[PDB]
Amino acid sequence: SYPAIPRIYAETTLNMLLKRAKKPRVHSIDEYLKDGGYQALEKALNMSPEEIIDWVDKSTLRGRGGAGFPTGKKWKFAVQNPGPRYFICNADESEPGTFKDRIIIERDPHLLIEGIIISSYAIGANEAYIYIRGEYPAGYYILRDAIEEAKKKGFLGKNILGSGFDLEIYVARGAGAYICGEETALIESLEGKRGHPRLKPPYPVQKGLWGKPTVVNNVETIANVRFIISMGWEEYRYIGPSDYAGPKLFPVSGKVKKPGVYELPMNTTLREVIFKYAGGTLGNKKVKAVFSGALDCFSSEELDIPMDYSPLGFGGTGTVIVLTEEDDIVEAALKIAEFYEHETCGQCTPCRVGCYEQANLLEKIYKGEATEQDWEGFDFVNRNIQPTSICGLGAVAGRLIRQTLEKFPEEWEKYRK
Amino acid sequence: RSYPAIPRIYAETTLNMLLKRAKKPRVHSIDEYLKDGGYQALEKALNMSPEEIIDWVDKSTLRGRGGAGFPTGKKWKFAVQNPGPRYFICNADESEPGTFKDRIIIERDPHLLIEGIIISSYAIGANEAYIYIRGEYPAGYYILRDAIEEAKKKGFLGKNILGSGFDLEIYVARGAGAYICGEETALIESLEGKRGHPRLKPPYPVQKGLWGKPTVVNNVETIANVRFIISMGWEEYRYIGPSDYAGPKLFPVSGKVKKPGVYELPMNTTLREVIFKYAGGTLGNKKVKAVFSGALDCFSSEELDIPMDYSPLGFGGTGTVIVLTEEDDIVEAALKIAEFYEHETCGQCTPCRVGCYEQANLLEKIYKGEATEQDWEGFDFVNRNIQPTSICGLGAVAGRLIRQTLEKFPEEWEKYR
Amino acid sequence: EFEFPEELKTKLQEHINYFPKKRQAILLCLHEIQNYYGYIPPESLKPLADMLELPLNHVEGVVAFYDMFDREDKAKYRIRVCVSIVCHLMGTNKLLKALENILGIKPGEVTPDGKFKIVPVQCLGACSEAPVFMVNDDEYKFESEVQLNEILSRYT
Amino acid sequence: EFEFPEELKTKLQEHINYFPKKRQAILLCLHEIQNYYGYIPPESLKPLADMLELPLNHVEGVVAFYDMFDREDKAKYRIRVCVSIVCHLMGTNKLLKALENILGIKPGEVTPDGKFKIVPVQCLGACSEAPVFMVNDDEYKFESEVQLNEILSRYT
Ligand SMILES: Cc1cc2nc3c(=O)[nH]c(=O)nc-3n(C[C@H](O)[C@H](O)[C@H](O)COP(=O)(O)O)c2cc1C
Ligand SMILES: Cc1cc2nc3c(=O)[nH]c(=O)nc-3n(C[C@H](O)[C@H](O)[C@H](O)COP(=O)(O)O)c2cc1C
Ligand code: SF4
Ligand code: SF4
Ligand code: FES
Ligand code: FES
Ligand SMILES: [Cl-]
Ligand SMILES: [Cl-]
Ligand SMILES: [Cl-]
Ligand code: NA
Ligand code: NA
Ligand code: NA
Ligand code: NA
Ligand code: NA
Ligand code: NA
Ligand code: NA
Ligand code: NA
Ligand code: NA
Ligand code: NA
Ligand code: NA
Structure with a gap:
């Protein structure tokens, strides 16, 4: 018995990450084994760590946490440095509009766990961690139980299936800080401290948990490892376009008829996501904007871009928040400002002060109480959150809002007039 | 999305239960249904034992709406006294002349029915359920299919529904022209892929049914009540209308009234009130000559003050009211009824097979003025000798209405002789 | 084969x-x-x-x-006409007359072009909207010839 | 001590x-x-x-x-209401209005009996089911007041 979870709609054209998680329920180990679960692990333990790294490299799998760093190269970087090494699954998923990782956690834990074990073995880590946000309590208990199940079927513990490889997966809980999704702050939290990002360099692959080589990979990244081993890198790359191959999860919300998670190839266009898959818009209103989480803002001019990692592609995490023609852009921007205000950890002064002032001033604008100086101030702080910032939050806390200013001037101008 | 054209049957309720949404002539999809507390009775049901649900439905006093008035909870009790697997079947064959009350649940408020099916199936330990819907309701069929998909998406169907450990799949089957497939044993024969031939009873479906296993067949309207029993509790439900015939009843009114349509009323309403207070009186303010209770009973203008309940002096049947006014030829009407039974006898029993044909063929001769004196005496005799050796109720009732027109309108028949 | x-x-x-x-x-x-x-x-x-x-x-x-x-x-469109009691009371005969005038066929017959077949049927469960007919899966109340002609024009 | x-x-x-x-x-x-x-x-x-x-x-x-x-x-039951962008678009304020109608409190406040506290939170990662709320560990989509009133009756 687990806490109540809303039944998010899930749909797939590729039937990989959502083969089971398209069904809104906990798939336990037996049902997992039935479809050939844990056989990729078995195959992996009969391979060298170097070869697994090679396959993940050649698959062109890239991180799904937002920074988009090649996974195999990441792993290769860590194994250049003496052990012991640690593997961390990043399940903090707290950016507005993003709910894709949780459906893997809640419906198909063993897809995740199988990935962690292969990955850990690939980098020689005997200690792995899932860091899951505190507001995902059902995910927490589902993971713990699925870990117990894996242990009893002999997939975890010492000398896993006679291989000589030992592994324990510990499940840690967050407690309300979006910044703890930043990998260095994640590691700080795991070491029992506040979620304060560390200055880079050094980089975790060199110096992370207890100063030791540490690979942090997103849940959805890890969800792909089973498949790369199972089908081989060459069959894997045949999925979608040669350039950006592989399955990808798109959490679609806002003013669409069918909000939910969609598993699609990355040659899909943003327009297709909205109109082909998510049923179009509510009331068939015209799309005004798409928020790529709390990162970017695309106009209705920019729908025909691919959902990939090309220069001109959507990028980000595939998070699609749809706003239609009656949605007030300033109102929406304020909500973004508020998020950043609540999530700056405050160690960098321009970020600390910017996030605060951007929200406070924008709220005055919104309420029609801004002075002429408040307006110029707002403009100014929005351009000056980033300086001296030691992590990406401060780099992007102004980004989306700046884009709305540049793409919807007429609607802002009305607030100024 | 897009469904076949359905006439917009008028609906009106003084109780606002079965016809709460279905008073509005359109499809009510899951979101609207949830907004009105949809599927919350299912949630409460799954936190009770099946035994309690059976108990509540028993104490509700709910009696079958399909025509035979068998107490619904008791029916469930009998089934669960036999070992599983068990099956649940929603009878949506509704093919009796004058009866269109079930279709408006199906087409307008499908989730009310689906909710009821799930609770009922859980009550009897059935993991497989069917809706058997007549082939001449294509819109209903596509609406039900779509609604089931919506239910799966929100996790009300499938495996381990809402963490309860209860599994259910609902399959939708379509009839293909045959009124007899509404008789429960013949329905079951059809579901097995055979002709609709009723089986000899005993044994009864609750003991030996679909694939010889314990089977509960319930009428659409019956199942539409289950939501209200769990939601309100059996005591409050029992308080609707007269205590001996409690709960909402649907009443399809047709023929020579101002407001033909389906009325949701308590069962202490009189036939007279149905016609004049609710259905707007008669066309042209003509005098009522008769009310056909579908193709089952014929009531004179002297019999309008009876209750629309299941008492011995009440209306009975399915509450189907077809109103005939002073200029309607009763013999012409009797012919149409004889023709119905002619077309619908399955033929297994000789007196039914031959009687249904002869009653119609001879009465056609009477109506057309071409009957010999022997034809008159024949018709009288065949009318009294359809029932002998009958396996099912069709042959028992094929002459009933017609006999009543001969007793209650002798002067009109004498004009034909 | x-x-x-x-x-x-x-x-x-x-x-x-x-x-x-x-x-x-x-x-x-x-x-x-x-x-x-x-x-x-x-x-x-x-x-x-x-x-x-x-x-x-x-x-x-x-x-x-x-x-x-x-x-x-073989018929492209099956015009199912209800011939049971209520539709009979409320004007099945007028519907078939209108059908004959428009299409030139009676119950049981197909138009020469294979397009339309009149199929007399039992109660279609819409008796309040009598007289009732279906064109394939679509179902309608008959009001009048002109109204009928307009419905049939939708079937190409 | x-x-x-x-x-x-x-x-x-x-x-x-x-x-x-x-x-x-x-x-x-x-x-x-x-x-x-x-x-x-x-x-x-x-x-x-x-x-x-x-x-x-x-x-x-x-x-x-x-x-x-x-x-x-102190609160028996924390009602975490999402106030971020997607829940806002889809009706956070209707959720809050309905909470106020039922419980008599606003965000930040605790009922007199100390049974319910309304906690405004950032995106809960269930945005497709906006507007989202939790009651301790349980999470739900808000549909309407009557639906909400029934959910809350479960916590005693
Ligand atoms: C403010 C901030 C929040 C982040 N939140 C997450 C998160 O919730 N989940 C995640 O996997 N990565 C998150 N990241 C990215 C991580 O720092 C890191 O790039 C990622 O977890 C590595 O996994 P990947 O290489 O497989 O993408 C966040 C980064 C920043 C700057
Ligand atoms: C000829 C014949 C036709 C019947 N047609 C129907 C029908 O269309 N729908 C129905 O629910 N019951 C019909 N019944 C009654 C069923 O056999 C059975 O009593 C009923 O479906 C049980 O459900 P209930 O207890 O909920 O009424 C028919 C019975 C006979 C003899
Ligand atoms: S940029 Fe902002 S969130 Fe990142 S470390 Fe500095 S103050 Fe903290
Ligand atoms: S009574 Fe008539 S309809 Fe019933 S089984 Fe016998 S022949 Fe068939
Ligand atoms: S009598 Fe024609 S539809 Fe019922
Ligand atoms: S914006 Fe409310 S759950 Fe994401
Ligand atoms: Cl990062
Ligand atoms: Cl101290
Ligand atoms: Cl029966
Ligand atoms: Na989930
Ligand atoms: Na250690
Ligand atoms: Na967190
Ligand atoms: Na705090
Ligand atoms: Na980092
Ligand atoms: Na604010
Ligand atoms: Na049938
Ligand atoms: Na028939
Ligand atoms: Na009574
Ligand atoms: Na019909
Ligand atoms: Na959550």
Whole structure:
């Protein structure tokens, strides 16, 4: 018995990450084994760590946490440095509009766990961690139980299936800080401290948990490892376009008829996501904007871009928040400002002060109480959150809002007039 | 999305239960249904034992709406006294002349029915359920299919529904022209892929049914009540209308009234009130000559003050009211009824097979003025000798209405002789 | 010889896969066949029986029993006219007259172009909207000839 | 004189023993304490500190930082209402209006009986089911007041 979870709609054209998680329920180990679960692990333990790294490299799998760093190269970087090494699954998923990782956690834990074990073995880590946000309590208990199940079927513990490889997966809980999704702050939290990002360099692959080589990979990244081993890198790359191959999860919300998670190839266009898959818009209103989480803002001019990692592609995490023609852009921007205000950890002064002032001033604008100086101030702080910032939050806390200013001037101008 | 054209049957309720949404002539999809507390009775049901649900439905006093008035909870009790697997079947064959009350649940408020099916199936330990819907309701069929998909998406169907450990799949089957497939044993024969031939009873479906296993067949309207029993509790439900015939009843009114349509009323309403207070009186303010209770009973203008309940002096049947006014030829009407039974006898029993044909063929001769004196005496005799050796109720009732027109309108028949 | 075009065969196989037992899918398969061909081709029955793992006489008997199925006349649109009590009381005869005036056929007949067949049927469960008729899956109240002509103009 | 009752002390020790190093169990411990009492007592921190082999101010620093922890208001049931972008578009304010109508409180406030506290939170990662709320660990989409009133009747 687990806490109540809303039944998010899930749909797939590729039937990989959502083969089971398209069904809104906990798939336990037996049902997992039935479809050939844990056989990729078995195959992996009969391979060298170097070869697994090679396959993940050649698959062109890239991180799904937002920074988009090649996974195999990441792993290769860590194994250049003496052990012991640690593997961390990043399940903090707290950016507005993003709910894709949780459906893997809640419906198909063993897809995740199988990935962690292969990955850990690939980098020689005997200690792995899932860091899951505190507001995902059902995910927490589902993971713990699925870990117990894996242990009893002999997939975890010492000398896993006679291989000589030992592994324990510990499940840690967050407690309300979006910044703890930043990998260095994640590691700080795991070491029992506040979620304060560390200055880079050094980089975790060199110096992370207890100063030791540490690979942090997103849940959805890890969800792909089973498949790369199972089908081989060459069959894997045949999925979608040669350039950006592989399955990808798109959490679609806002003013669409069918909000939910969609598993699609990355040659899909943003327009297709909205109109082909998510049923179009509510009331068939015209799309005004798409928020790529709390990162970017695309106009209705920019729908025909691919959902990939090309220069001109959507990028980000595939998070699609749809706003239609009656949605007030300033109102929406304020909500973004508020998020950043609540999530700056405050160690960098321009970020600390910017996030605060951007929200406070924008709220005055919104309420029609801004002075002429408040307006110029707002403009100014929005351009000056980033300086001296030691992590990406401060780099992007102004980004989306700046884009709305540049793409919807007429609607802002009305607030100024 | 897009469904076949359905006439917009008028609906009106003084109780606002079965016809709460279905008073509005359109499809009510899951979101609207949830907004009105949809599927919350299912949630409460799954936190009770099946035994309690059976108990509540028993104490509700709910009696079958399909025509035979068998107490619904008791029916469930009998089934669960036999070992599983068990099956649940929603009878949506509704093919009796004058009866269109079930279709408006199906087409307008499908989730009310689906909710009821799930609770009922859980009550009897059935993991497989069917809706058997007549082939001449294509819109209903596509609406039900779509609604089931919506239910799966929100996790009300499938495996381990809402963490309860209860599994259910609902399959939708379509009839293909045959009124007899509404008789429960013949329905079951059809579901097995055979002709609709009723089986000899005993044994009864609750003991030996679909694939010889314990089977509960319930009428659409019956199942539409289950939501209200769990939601309100059996005591409050029992308080609707007269205590001996409690709960909402649907009443399809047709023929020579101002407001033909389906009325949701308590069962202490009189036939007279149905016609004049609710259905707007008669066309042209003509005098009522008769009310056909579908193709089952014929009531004179002297019999309008009876209750629309299941008492011995009440209306009975399915509450189907077809109103005939002073200029309607009763013999012409009797012919149409004889023709119905002619077309619908399955033929297994000789007196039914031959009687249904002869009653119609001879009465056609009477109506057309071409009957010999022997034809008159024949018709009288065949009318009294359809029932002998009958396996099912069709042959028992094929002459009933017609006999009543001969007793209650002798002067009109004498004009034909 | 006779085989199902794959487009039809796929839908057929879906129905067969839909219920737990293949033979349950017989009525759905037959609806599908009558939708594809505008009728049930006699030749179509042996290969259906194969797919259902049923004897042919079983499926023949089933086709014979259920009145919606037609093995004799190909029609693009089946005009199902209710001939039971309520529709009779409220004007079935006026509907068929209007049908004859417009199409030039009576119950049981097909138009020369194969387009329309009048099928007299029992109560369609819409008696408050009598007199009632269906055009394939679409269902309507008959009001008048002119109104009827406009509905039929929608079927091309 | 503040001491954790045995049942709690036991659960805390489980967490401290779960990770390789004791200090890694601080957030699990703090979730436990808040679950047990309905807030984080200030008196709990010193003894927690001793079990983790950490100084008190480290522990206090941690409580101040992590938004799920509350040292001020005891509540049986925390109603976490999402106030971020997607829930806002889809009807956070209707959710709050309905909460006020039922419970008589606004965000920040605790019922007199101390049974329900409304906690405004950032995106809960269920945006397709906006507007989203939790009641302790349970999570739900808000549909309407009547639907909400029924959900809340489950917490006694
Ligand atoms: C403010 C901030 C929040 C982040 N939140 C997450 C998160 O919730 N989940 C995640 O996997 N990565 C998150 N990241 C990215 C991580 O720092 C890191 O790039 C990622 O977890 C590595 O996994 P990947 O290489 O497989 O993408 C965040 C980064 C920043 C700057
Ligand atoms: C000829 C004949 C036709 C019937 N048609 C129907 C029908 O269309 N729908 C129905 O629910 N019951 C019909 N019945 C009654 C069923 O056999 C059975 O009593 C009923 O479906 C049980 O459900 P209930 O207890 O909820 O009424 C028919 C019975 C006979 C004899
Ligand atoms: S940029 Fe902002 S969030 Fe990142 S470390 Fe600095 S103050 Fe903290
Ligand atoms: S009574 Fe008539 S309809 Fe019923 S089984 Fe016998 S022949 Fe068939
Ligand atoms: S009598 Fe014609 S539809 Fe009922
Ligand atoms: S915006 Fe509310 S759950 Fe994401
Ligand atoms: Cl990062
Ligand atoms: Cl019966
Ligand atoms: Cl100290
Ligand atoms: Na989920
Ligand atoms: Na967190
Ligand atoms: Na980083
Ligand atoms: Na604000
Ligand atoms: Na039928
Ligand atoms: Na018929
Ligand atoms: Na009474
Ligand atoms: Na019909
Ligand atoms: Na260690
Ligand atoms: Na805080
Ligand atoms: Na959540």
